[PDB]
Design a protein around this ligand. Structure first.
Ligand SMILES: *C(=O)N1C[C@H](NOS(=O)(=O)O)CC[C@H]1C(N)=O
Ligand SMILES: [Ca+2]
Length: 241
C-alpha cells in the first residue's frame, strides 16, 4: 500500500481527522492508496455500514424474502422522518432505518451472527454486546483496510451467500450513476466517528474506498464523510466533475 500523505489537504479542506483507503482497479497493478496507514488498520464499530453484511445475513436466514416485502411500521416515532413509515429493503438502506435491522437481528440467531461473521472474517467477528446493538454498541469492529477486503469479496460475488443475494445488496447500495459509472456506497455514524465505504464502477474497472473520520461536531461533521471521499475520487478521475 502506497502512502498518500499529500492527501492531508483533502481532510484539512474540511477540517477533519481521519483515514481513507482507496483500491483502484482501473488498468492493472496500481498501488493501494492510503492516508494515515496506521489509522487505516485500526478497527472501529461499523455502525450503519454493517447494513451491507446484515442484509446478506437476513436474506440468507429468511428474515427478508426480497426487495418487495413490506415491513409494517409499529406507529412509534422512534427516529427521524424517513424512519417513521412502512419500509422495504431499499427505503431501509437509503434512510438507514435502524428498526428494520433490529427486527432482522432478533430473527437471526445470536449464534448465527457469530457463524456468519466468522464465515466471512468480518473485522474481529465478535457480536458480543452489553446493551445496545452489537454493530454499533458492542465488540464488533473492523478497519478501513478490512472494509475494502470485504467489499471486494461482495463485488466479485465471492462471499458465501447466494449470488442472487449478493447482487440484490449491491443494487440496494446504488446512490448515483451516470451512463458510464455507478456509485455504490453506505454511510455509518457511531456518534464519535463516522464512515463512508463503497466503490465506483467504471468501464476500465472499479475504485473501492473506505473512509472513517472522527466527528467531534456531531451532525455538522456528517457531510464531511462524502465530501472528503468525493474530492479524492475526483482528484483521480474516479468521479465526474
Ligand atoms: C448508522 O450508522 N446509523 C443509523 C442512522 N443513519 O446513519 S447514516 O446517516 O450514517 O446512514 C442514524 C445514525 C446511526 C445510528 N445512531 O444508529
Ligand atoms: Ca484492473
Amino acid at each position: 500500500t502506497l502512502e498518500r500523505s499529500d492527501w492531508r489537504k483533502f481532510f484539512s479542506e474540511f477540517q477533519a481527522k481521519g483515514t481513507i483507503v482507496v483500491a483502484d482497479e482501473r488498468q492493472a497493478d496500481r498501488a493501494m492508496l492510503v492516508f494515515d496507514p496506521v489509522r487505516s488498520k485500526k478497527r472501529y464499530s461499523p455502525a450503519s455500514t454493517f447494513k451491507i453484511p446484515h442484509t446478506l445475513f437476513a436474506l440468507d436466514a429468511g428474515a427478508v424474502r426480497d426487495e418487495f416485502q413490506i415491513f409494517r411500521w409499529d406507529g412509534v416515532n422512534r427516529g427521524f422522518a424517513g424512519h417513521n413509515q412502512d419500509q422495504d429493503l431499499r427505503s431501509a438502506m437509503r434512510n438507514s432505518t435502524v428498526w428494520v435491522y433490529e427486527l432482522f437481528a432478533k430473527e437471526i440467531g445470536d449464534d448465527k451472527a457469530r457463524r456468519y461473521l466468522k464465515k466471512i472474517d468480518y473485522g474481529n467477528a465478535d457480536p458480543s454486546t452489553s446493551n445496545g446493538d452489537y454493530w454499533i454498541e458492542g465488540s464488533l469492529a473492523i478497519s478501513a483496510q478490512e472494509q475494502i477486503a470485504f467489499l471486494r469479496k461482495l463485488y466479485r460475488n465471492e462471499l458465501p451467500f447466494r449470488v442472487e443475494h449478493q447482487r440484490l445488496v449491491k443494487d440496494l447500495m446504488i446512490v448515483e450513476a451516470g451512463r458510464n459509472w455507478i456509485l455504490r456506497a453506505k454511510t455509518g455514524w457511531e456518534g464519535r466517528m463516522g464512515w463512508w465505504v463503497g466503490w465506483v464502477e467504471w468501464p476500465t474497472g472499479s475504485v473501492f474506498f473506505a473512509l472513517n473520520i472522527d466527528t467531534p461536531n456531531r451532525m455538522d461533521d456528517l457531510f464531511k464523510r462524502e465530501a472528503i471521499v468525493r474530492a479524492i475520487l475526483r482528484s483521480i478521475e474516479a468521479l465526474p466533475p
